[PDB]
């Protein structure tokens with residue numbers, strides 16, 4: 454089907470369940486690198502009436518730890534907010550529900566802002582074609598390929 458979170462035909466309900474982080478991209482690469490606070494490996498989304506429960510794991514020297522966050526709907530169509538290392542708002546520009554999900558997040562902290570984009574899959578990896586589509590969307594947002602990190606071979610635990 455394919456829909457947008459800000460789109461009218463969006464069914465947030467259909468994003469419920471298992472996901473995997475496939476690719477992260479950012480305006481500020483350090484945020485997603487080895488020691489970055491936003492290098493998060495999504496495991497599950499639980500869709501509630503006015504919020505999303507997000508379950509992640511993070512990696513630190515092959516040592517995994519769990520992290521959970523609750524994101525609230527804002528007043529903008531298809532947008533959610535969550536406090537984590539600053540204030541974040543995110544939307545879901547594209548998803549087909551049963552295979553991939555593309556997210557766009559804006560973080561604000563200490564007078565600075567950065568953008569993060571993520572490609573998530575129902576399976577541990579996605580086709581190279583979908584990965585290229587993601588790169589194209591990143592380009593549209595001013596994120597170059599040198600700032601796109603494929604984490605598929607690290608999205609284990």
Ligand SMILES: CC[C@@H](C)c1nccs1
Pocket residue numbers: 493495507535537541543556558571573
């Ligand atoms: C799908 C996961 C996106 C939306 C995340 N939310 C808070 C940090 S990244």
